[PDB]
Amino acid sequence: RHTFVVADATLPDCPLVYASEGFYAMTGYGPDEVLGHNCRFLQGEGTDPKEVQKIRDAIKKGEACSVRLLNYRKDGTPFWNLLTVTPIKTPDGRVSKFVGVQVDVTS
């Protein structure tokens, strides 16, 4: 079971532009609160800053990356998010979008 989003990398802070219905159902947030925003609103008190940095750098360098993050639903309850971000390039080598697969691996 997994969810999927698309971030717009032509915009400077990679706002989310599409999300599967499972992403909304998993996180508790609506498209009115997800679209146009950077994915980091799902982070909170216990999110590991060393892991958050791995994504920050892979996004700046335009690489693929996979990290384990503690995330929080709209109602405040936490869950463990296995997150893999893939860069999507244009033919001229520039990154156009980042795509994300999120798995809830709280098991």
Ligand X SMILES: *[C@@]12=NC3=[C]C([C])=C([C])[C]=C3N([C][C]([O])[C]([O])[C]([O])[C]OP([O])([O])=O)C1=NC(=O)[N]C2=O
Nearest to 100 by CA among 12, 48, 34: 34
The answer to whether residue 71 forms part of the interface with ligand X (CB under 6 A) is yes
Judged by CB under 6 A, the residue of 14, 19, 26, 34 near ligand X is: 14
Question: With respect to ligand X, which residue has the nearer C-beta, 20 or 43?
Answer: 43
Q: Reduced to 3 DSSP states, what percent helix, strand and coil does the chain have, rounded to the nearest 5? A: 25, 35, 35
Q: Examine residue 20 and tell whether it contacts ligand X (CB under 6 A).
A: no
- Choose among 89, 87, 93: nearest CA to 7: 87
The Cα 61–Cα 55 span in angstroms is 10
Does the annotation list 41 as a binding residue? yes
Using the minimum distance from each CB to ligand X, give the nearer residue, 12 or 91.
Answer: 12
Q: 104 forms bridges with which residues in the sheet?
A: 81
For ligand X, the binding residue among 60, 69, 73, 93 (CB under 6 A) is 69
- 53: annotated binding-site residue? no
Among 19, 26, 34, 83, binds ligand X (CB under 6 A): 83
Going from the C-alpha of 21 to that of each of 30, 46, 60, 83, the distances in angstroms are 9, 26, 28, 17
Q: Which residue ranges make up the site for ligand X (CB under 6 A)?
A: 5, 7, 14, 38-40, 42-43, 52, 55-56, 59, 69, 71, 81, 83, 85, 98-100, 102
